[PDB]
């Protein structure tokens, strides 16, 4: 079915590949060629995860884990029962994410709007690819990718962080955390501001963007405006993710694996301004 | 207001009370059976 206003927009055309073969909707969802491909990749991946779990000890959802290959295989294809399932789930996942971004591009073209959403999703895709492809390749073996498990990839994060002393002292990581915390702050501020203007105090009319500008001024000191806030939010989230990716690229390929991020900062303490 | 006439209200309420009462009877029978299986409320020294 359609929203009460949707029929105007469900027009033909705007696809990238395939013509009108897949130019249709299934309920709410637009399909396109990339929608078929995305469901294909997602389902092959989920079935490989289920099979890897069937080979494993437990079905416990928290303990399910698809582990990367042993370091003995380096950057080569591992046997399916000794890490190859991880590589194939990774290929299926990157395929799913890419075809999902492309389906979003097709929907953008069909609606006649900008491509900001697929572009922004490409940043999360890039962070994932950094984690499972770029960083283990730079470090020489697929064993550096994280295991696909709800609580085993947390163990991977813990071990990876503690292998560099304390990961908090990673500078790009500090920048990324600052960006994430500011993104959460700005999301709360923006949501609350719009909800305050739309749902005012009792007996009050719905407030205007001028009131929003005034209260934003009184809080943050100045005003960015209705388009500035969405720009700033996009920028904050994207830069958080980009600096997370940089953070991961510089630890292991650049700073040695058994290195120390706390000790890297001694370059400042050891400046000739104050060292001797 | 819920947009319901008092005739509709009394009708719904009578059916609701009947249903609630049958539910209570079933639950009471269930708790009697459960108590016959395992009594709760031990003494201060245990079961």
């Amino acid at each position: 079915a359609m929203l009460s206003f949707e029929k105007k927009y469900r027009v033909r055309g705007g696809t990238l590949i395939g013509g009108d073969l897949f130019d249709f909707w299934v309920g709410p969802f637009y399909v396109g060629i990339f929608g078929v491909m995305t469901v294909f990749f997602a389902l092959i991946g989920i079935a490989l995860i289920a099979w890897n779990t069937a080979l494993g000890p437990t079905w416990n959802l928290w303990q399910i884990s698809v582990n990367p290959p042993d370091a003995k295989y380096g950057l080569g294809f591992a046997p399916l029962a000794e890490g190859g399932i991880w590589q194939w789930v990774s290929i299926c996942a990157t395929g799913a994410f890419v075809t999902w971004a492309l389906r979003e591009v097709e929907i953008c073209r069909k609606l006649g709007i900008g491509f900001h959403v697929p572009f922004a999703f490409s940043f999360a895709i890039f962070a994932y690819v950094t984690l499972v492809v770029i960083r283990p390749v730079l470090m020489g073996s697929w064993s550096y990718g994280f295991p696909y498990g709800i609580f085993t990839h947390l163990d991977w994060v813990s071990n990876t962080g503690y292998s560099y002393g304390q990961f908090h002292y990673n500078p790009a990581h500090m920048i990324a955390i600052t960006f994430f915390f500011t993104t959460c702050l700005a999301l709360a501020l923006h949501g609350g501001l719009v909800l305050s203007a739309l749902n005012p105090d009792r007996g009050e009319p719905v407030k205007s963007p001028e009131h929003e500008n005034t209260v934003f001024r009184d809080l943050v000191g100045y005003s960015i405006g209705t388009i500035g806030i969405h720009r700033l939010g996009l920028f904050l989230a994207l830069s958080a993710v980009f600096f997370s990716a940089v953070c991961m690229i510089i630890s292991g390929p650049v700073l040695a694996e058994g290195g120390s991020w706390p000790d890297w900062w001694n370059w400042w303490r050891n400046l000739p301004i104050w060292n001797p | 207001i819920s947009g319901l006439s008092e005739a509709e209200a009394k009708e719904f309420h009578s059916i609701f009370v009947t249903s609630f009462f049958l539910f209570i009877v079933v639950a009471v029978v269930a708790h009697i059976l459960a108590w016959m299986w395992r009594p709760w409320l031990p003494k201060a020294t245990g079961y």
Binding site: E6, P28, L187, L195, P200 | -
Partner: protein
């Protein structure tokens, strides 16, 4: 072209703002225009209304900051050279464990206690200021209750969990790298905070707020050519921009928000991050002392 920047920027008079209810004072009159601010957003840099609660909030906060800084200077023998050298490593450390919840000597946590008291009073006064600035314009108080969640996490970190543990020594220090080390040692001392479920939930809601604000910013910039950034007007009188946004997300994932409910989603994700965080912190130590053991007990 896309709306990451403004091509043509018009400039005019300074706006005094909406007149307030008869319960406030005359605001400032700075009202200056910065060019780069208008490049990325709006250009006006005022006028900041600073009433009683704002002034007392800044006074208490700067009392706290003065205490912290003077303690970091004293801990380094007043050397400004050594202060610049060691700055990120300096901190006003919390009281010692031997003192519990008493008022310890100044050099053993009394200064920390006084700085924490004054910072808490500053933050509560700033919260009251947000509340009044919203309700002096006739608006809702959603921003204030979003701020109250961050305040609840901050109180749990510095006040509530130290209370329930019976010692001010549990609380963070006032320093950059030292409070990072406090975070690390807190995770290490209480098992592994990755197995705190409310920590997992807080991380879920932080990642989700980043995800949601990327999605929403990108969506509004994508339909800004149809007037999408005027969200209040698009909610009161739905235009084609918000229709296109709703249809983008409905065709992408099967469901969409409206111009107002997307901001409820945003508010609630951003608020649930520190709410679940505060719960998970209050549980860590008074209730659960080893989170990995708890996780093994469950999964």
């Amino acid at each position: 072209y896309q709306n990451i920047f403004t091509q043509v920027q018009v400039e005019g008079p300074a706006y005094a703002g909406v007149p307030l209810r008869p319960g406030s004072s005359p605001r400032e009159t700075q009202t200056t225009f910065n060019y780069w601010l208008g490049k990325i957003g709006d250009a006006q840099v005022g006028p900041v209304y600073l009433g009683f609660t704002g002034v007392c909030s800044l006074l208490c906060g700067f009392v706290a900051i003065e205490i912290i800084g003077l303690n970091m200077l004293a801990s380094v023998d007043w050397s400004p050279i050594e202060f610049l050298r060691q700055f990120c490593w300096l901190a006003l450390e919390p009281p010692k464990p031997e003192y519990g919840l008493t008022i310890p000597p100044l050099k053993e946590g009394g200064w920390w206690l006084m700085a924490g008291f004054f910072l808490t009073v500053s933050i509560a006064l700033w919260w009251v200021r947000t509340y009044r600035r919203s309700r002096a314009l006739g608006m809702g108080t959603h921003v204030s209750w979003a701020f109250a969640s961050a305040i609840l996490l901050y109180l749990a970190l510095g006040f509530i969990q130290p209370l329930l543990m019976g010692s001010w020594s549990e609380a963070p220090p006032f320093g950059v790298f030292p409070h990072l080390d406090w975070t690390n040692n807190f995770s290490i001392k209480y098992g592994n905070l990755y197995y705190n479920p409310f920590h997992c939930l807080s991380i879920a809601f932080l990642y989700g707020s980043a995800l949601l604000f990327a999605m929403h910013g990108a969506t509004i910039l994508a339909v800004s050519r149809y007037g999408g950034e005027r969200e209040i007007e698009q909610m009161l009188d739905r235009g084609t921009a918000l229709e296109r946004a709703a249809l983008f997300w409905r065709w992408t994932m099967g469901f969409n928000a409206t111009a107002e409910s997307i901001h409820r989603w945003a508010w609630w994700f951003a608020v649930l991050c520190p709410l679940t965080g505060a719960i998970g912190i209050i549980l860590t130590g008074p209730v659960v002392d080893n989170w990995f053991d708890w996780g093994v007990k469950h999964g």
